[PDB]
Design a protein around this ligand. Sequence first.
Ligand SMILES: [Mg+2]
Ligand SMILES: [Mg+2]
Ligand SMILES: [Mg+2]
Ligand SMILES: [Mg+2]
Ligand SMILES: [Mg+2]
Ligand SMILES: [Mg+2]
Ligand SMILES: [Mg+2]
Ligand SMILES: [Mg+2]
Ligand SMILES: [Mg+2]
Ligand SMILES: [Mg+2]
Ligand SMILES: [Mg+2]
Ligand SMILES: [Mg+2]
Ligand SMILES: [Mg+2]
Ligand SMILES: [Mg+2]
Ligand SMILES: [Mg+2]
Ligand SMILES: [Mg+2]
Ligand SMILES: [Mg+2]
Ligand SMILES: [Mg+2]
Ligand SMILES: [Mg+2]
Ligand SMILES: [Mg+2]
Ligand SMILES: [Mg+2]
Ligand SMILES: [Mg+2]
Ligand SMILES: [Mg+2]
Ligand SMILES: [Mg+2]
Ligand SMILES: [Mg+2]
Ligand SMILES: [Mg+2]
Ligand SMILES: [Mg+2]
Ligand SMILES: [Mg+2]
Ligand SMILES: [Mg+2]
Ligand SMILES: [Mg+2]
Ligand SMILES: [Mg+2]
Ligand SMILES: [Mg+2]
Ligand SMILES: [Mg+2]
Ligand SMILES: [Mg+2]
Ligand SMILES: [Mg+2]
Lengths: 194, 99, 148, 203, 51
Amino acid sequence: AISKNLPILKNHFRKHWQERVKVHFDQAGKKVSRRNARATRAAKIAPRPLDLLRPVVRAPTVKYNRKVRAGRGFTLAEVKAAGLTAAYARTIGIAVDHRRQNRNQEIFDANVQRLKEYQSKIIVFPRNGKAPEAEQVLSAAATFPIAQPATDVEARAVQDNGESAFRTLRLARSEKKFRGIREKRAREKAEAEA
Amino acid sequence: TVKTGIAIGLNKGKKVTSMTPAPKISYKKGAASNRTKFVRSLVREIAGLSPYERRLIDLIRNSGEKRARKVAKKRLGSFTRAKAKVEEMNNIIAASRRH
Amino acid sequence: PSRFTKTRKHRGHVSAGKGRIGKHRKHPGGRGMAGGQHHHRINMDKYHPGYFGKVGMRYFHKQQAHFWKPVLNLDKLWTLIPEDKRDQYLKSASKETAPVIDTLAAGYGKILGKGRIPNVPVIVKARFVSKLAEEKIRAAGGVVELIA
Amino acid sequence: GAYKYLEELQRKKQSDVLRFLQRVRVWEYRQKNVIHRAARPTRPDKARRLGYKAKQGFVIYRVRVRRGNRKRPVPKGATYGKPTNQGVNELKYQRSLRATAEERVGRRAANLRVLNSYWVNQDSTYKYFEVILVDPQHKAIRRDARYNWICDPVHKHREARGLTATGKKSRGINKGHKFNNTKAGRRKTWKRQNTLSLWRYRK
Amino acid sequence: NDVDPIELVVFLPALCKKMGVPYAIVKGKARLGTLVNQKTSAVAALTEVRA
RNA sequence: UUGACAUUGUGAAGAGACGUUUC
RNA sequence: GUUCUUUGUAAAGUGCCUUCGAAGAGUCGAGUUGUUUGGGAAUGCAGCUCUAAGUGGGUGGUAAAUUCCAUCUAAAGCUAA
RNA sequence: UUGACCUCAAAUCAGGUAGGAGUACCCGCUGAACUUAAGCAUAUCAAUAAGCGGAGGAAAAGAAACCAACCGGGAUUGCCUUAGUAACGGCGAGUGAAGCGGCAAAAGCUCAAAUUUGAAAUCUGGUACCUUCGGUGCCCGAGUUGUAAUUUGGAGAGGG
Ligand SMILES: [Mg+2]
Ligand SMILES: [Mg+2]
Ligand SMILES: [Mg+2]
Ligand SMILES: [Mg+2]
Ligand SMILES: [Mg+2]
Ligand SMILES: [Mg+2]
Ligand SMILES: [Mg+2]
Ligand SMILES: [Mg+2]
Ligand SMILES: [Mg+2]
Ligand SMILES: [Mg+2]
Ligand SMILES: [Mg+2]
Ligand SMILES: [Mg+2]
Ligand SMILES: [Mg+2]
Ligand SMILES: [Mg+2]
Ligand SMILES: [Mg+2]
Ligand SMILES: [Mg+2]
Ligand SMILES: [Mg+2]
Ligand SMILES: [Mg+2]
Ligand SMILES: [Mg+2]
Ligand SMILES: [Mg+2]
Ligand SMILES: [Mg+2]
Ligand SMILES: [Mg+2]
Ligand SMILES: [Mg+2]
Ligand SMILES: [Mg+2]
Ligand SMILES: [Mg+2]
Ligand SMILES: [Mg+2]
Ligand SMILES: [Mg+2]
Ligand SMILES: [Mg+2]
Ligand SMILES: [Mg+2]
Ligand SMILES: [Mg+2]
Ligand SMILES: [Mg+2]
Ligand SMILES: [Mg+2]
Ligand SMILES: [Mg+2]
Ligand SMILES: [Mg+2]
Ligand SMILES: [Mg+2]
């Protein structure tokens, strides 16, 4: 039924919903599991650090490309440009990704930079048994953070070349719209011949 | 490809010093190669023409290249697929005529 | 909590609060939005005009935040510059050591012209500005740098 | 490589060489039982391609299945229900006849595990399939590191669950927008978006 | 002359033909087997041969 | 129940479609 | 952390040059029918009819002809949390 | 008359395997109506109950015939969110996801297609010995209608 001045609700409960209620009573005790099993992973991983070294990556969509984001892997271009093989890189602390390419130098250069800076900061133990112990560092990600670049300085000079920025956009947009139309009227200029 | 650095318009997008990434062989997936180019030749003259193929070339040297295409589009399920088949006929027809 | 509830007050009066003539029956008038065009029409017109019928264009597989373009007014603008750093730029009032504000970095996507700012030059970098917003900036000794 | 020729010869099913072959073979296959043991893969280039390997432990079966829609097994047509569900004669089975093929041999050879199958012939009445199986207790496979995975209990009757190739087809497993339901597994993904998650500190 | 399936071998005389290669459709897939110490051999062809 | 398509192949008389070919 | 073993003239990685670079068919796809899906000139699934190709093929949430662009590599498989 | 091959059989032949149970959770098939719409048939309930087949300690999914239209992203699963939104709907009742973003966990791969052709290099079994989840030798068989090795698209192969 309908009455009084209230908003029209849309509560989808016409379907035996109670057969499927997930009440996270285990939110607490699962945190303990997620720990206790991180703890005991960190053990048998010897002195290795739980997580792989991961790239900088720009992050997709017009909504988000302003920020920068840890990607999945390092490309093959960056790995050889770091002077080592992908196949061996996996066996250290490094994540590789055969799909995913470089079309941006400033992410490449800054990623080969990570790779270099990473090698220099870890000690790869020799293949036998005895070693120089070393303490166990848990995160690579803590150790090698990703930060967003520089884009500009705190202040510069006002430089007004006179072009209104609004109008620059306007004309820019009009350009798009009719380019196709113009692509036509021109074609009939060729077809307007004797 | 040559981005204007402006956020709208006929090639919008922030300017980035570009690279041009090593080409994937996966992009060469349907690539011919002398191997298949040979075998598919040899199967043709062994196996021969197929029914609709036999009428396809027939419409060709008769009721135009047009009418043959319409049949070929109905028969194969795609216009593009038809034109590419009708073409393949004309080359067979080419061989039979001028040997 | 139930202790404060009205139904505690009602115990011992027949029929709860619901009456003798008119009961509390099991859905008079129908469940949910029934009879909107019919017996529940007087409430639907008034309180919910517009409810019925289509209007406008359809858009399959629409992706919100293809249209991500959050707004910022000159009305603020100077909020984007860190407080303590602000005073400095406020008096320096220079066209030569003018402050730069990367609005897109702040998370915005268009500057709009509401309100007034002081005569101080600002280099404002953004995607899209209002014809009036850039007019005010330009008139305060600043400029607009289009970015992406 | 004689195979590359076969692969490309097999494509010309309307060629006389193949018409003739198809015509003579669909008769032979019909006079044998609905299900029988096959000597050796009539499509050696094809069995191979699906993972078959000519050795001790790979078995090939051939099987007739009946072709057409599924007549709703309801008594005298009577649906007893709304008119939507009054259908009988135009209803199509959600699995593929090849799945019905795989499933039928797999019960006859319940001591083997089903690896894959492929078409070989059809007619108005039957589609014909050769199904490739593998013995999980024959040492040639138990020691083969490439195929020992199928000895695991987790692959028992994999064809009756749709883990086979036709099985993952009809079950609609594939990446993409065209497979939003059916992908993580139709029912499972349903139960997901139909479950009510309440945390301890309600949000 | 007796290979089943025949599709294994049909394209051969024509594969030979295109290359010049001399061929013969000998009788006996079991005869060619004996020829290589097996049970059946389908095909058999020498290339070198002492002078 | 009627028609099409599929299962569907080989040789002819014909009236037919412009020695092939669909009736 | 010890000790038998027993492996080699054999396995692997990397630099430039050059020539090749095989990639799954009664499938993909299309019609039509039923079913399903938020998927809307048709989201998946199936039945019958048609049935490909290799600078091919698929996808790009409005059908079609035409021109471009972009993005993966189907019709075979394994795999812990 | 003798010996092979192909196909098809038989044995209480030699050794194995399947069934049946359980089924909370899992992979499919098959499939309602009560009910809601204040009537009702489309729709709803519900791609649910019931019925059938098949697994495990998880199952399934999984290294893109993906997402995207960005400066792009990068196996799968899941939680937070996208969002009661785009969209479906006698456009009525009602239904109703996806992409990005943060997180948990992280792992990558191998066949088919290739001349080993200067060596079928591969494998079951029997059998003798031993150090027995097996090693070695011998024999039969399997296999050229292709068992090994190298190669799987990220590549890679043949030569210098
Ligand atoms: Mg619980
Ligand atoms: Mg981690
Ligand atoms: Mg009172
Ligand atoms: Mg009272
Ligand atoms: Mg009363
Ligand atoms: Mg009254
Ligand atoms: Mg009223
Ligand atoms: Mg304001
Ligand atoms: Mg039937
Ligand atoms: Mg399978
Ligand atoms: Mg190598
Ligand atoms: Mg493929
Ligand atoms: Mg159904
Ligand atoms: Mg449909
Ligand atoms: Mg597909
Ligand atoms: Mg699997
Ligand atoms: Mg016995
Ligand atoms: Mg059972
Ligand atoms: Mg019923
Ligand atoms: Mg009820
Ligand atoms: Mg009712
Ligand atoms: Mg009522
Ligand atoms: Mg009633
Ligand atoms: Mg049930
Ligand atoms: Mg069951
Ligand atoms: Mg168990
Ligand atoms: Mg677990
Ligand atoms: Mg599994
Ligand atoms: Mg791949
Ligand atoms: Mg992903
Ligand atoms: Mg109404
Ligand atoms: Mg629904
Ligand atoms: Mg994410
Ligand atoms: Mg191999
Ligand atoms: Mg080389």
